Amino acid sequence: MDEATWERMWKHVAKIHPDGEKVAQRIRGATDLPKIPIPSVPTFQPSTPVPERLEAVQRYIRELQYNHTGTQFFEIKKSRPLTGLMDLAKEMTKEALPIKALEAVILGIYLTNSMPTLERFPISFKTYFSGNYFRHIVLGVNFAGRYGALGMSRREDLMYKPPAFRTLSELVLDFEAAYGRCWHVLKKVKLGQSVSHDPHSVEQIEWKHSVLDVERLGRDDFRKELERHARDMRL
């Protein structure tokens, strides 16, 4: 990154960290800092079952670390054609910097395009906690009729899910329960369509094909609308 963005990051650090400038004083120019290995982009034998591949993909995502610096290192324009987002995903693997939820979704797509028997679709959440709204996103996946997820979160139970849920409803209800355990109220769920496995596709990701108002729908219509989206995807 350029001089200007670099100084912007450290200026931001000074305002949000309590010790402020002393963090920058310790780190900037320090000579014996840990060398961070560049995480190895996972590659897969054809004998390896898809669920085991998903474990390796998620391990790679986790190795990059959640970005707590306050500065996003990759700009993600969500309307960009898939081929452009996949160029960005490659750049993410080469620069190997910390990431947040949306970056992990793009990486998850990039690293599973080699899995045509796996369907991938974004799942975004809108939640409410302590008078404020929060947004989060994961990459929902479907293998052999079971649902799981890839992603990046501050919390362990708001990202990776092995593909073992029998319905999309059960997957989303598991996220809702995890949010409840962190005292968030789940307000909306936005579900995208399946993403092409062609990394040179020029079509856009459809992020918000279904928008579910959890509170207005109620338990049974919530599940029914989730079942409808799953049907929409099997086309």
Binding site: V23, I27, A30, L33, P34, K35, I36, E95
Partner: peptide, 24 residues
């Protein structure tokens, strides 16, 4: 090469910062 060196120095400082911010 000066470019790669600059990016590697930045990356090492980014991760050192990320640990500090994670611990906070």
């Amino acid at each position: 090469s000066a470019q790669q060196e600059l990016k590697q120095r930045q990356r090492a400082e980014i991760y050192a910062l990320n640990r500090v911010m994670t611990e906070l």
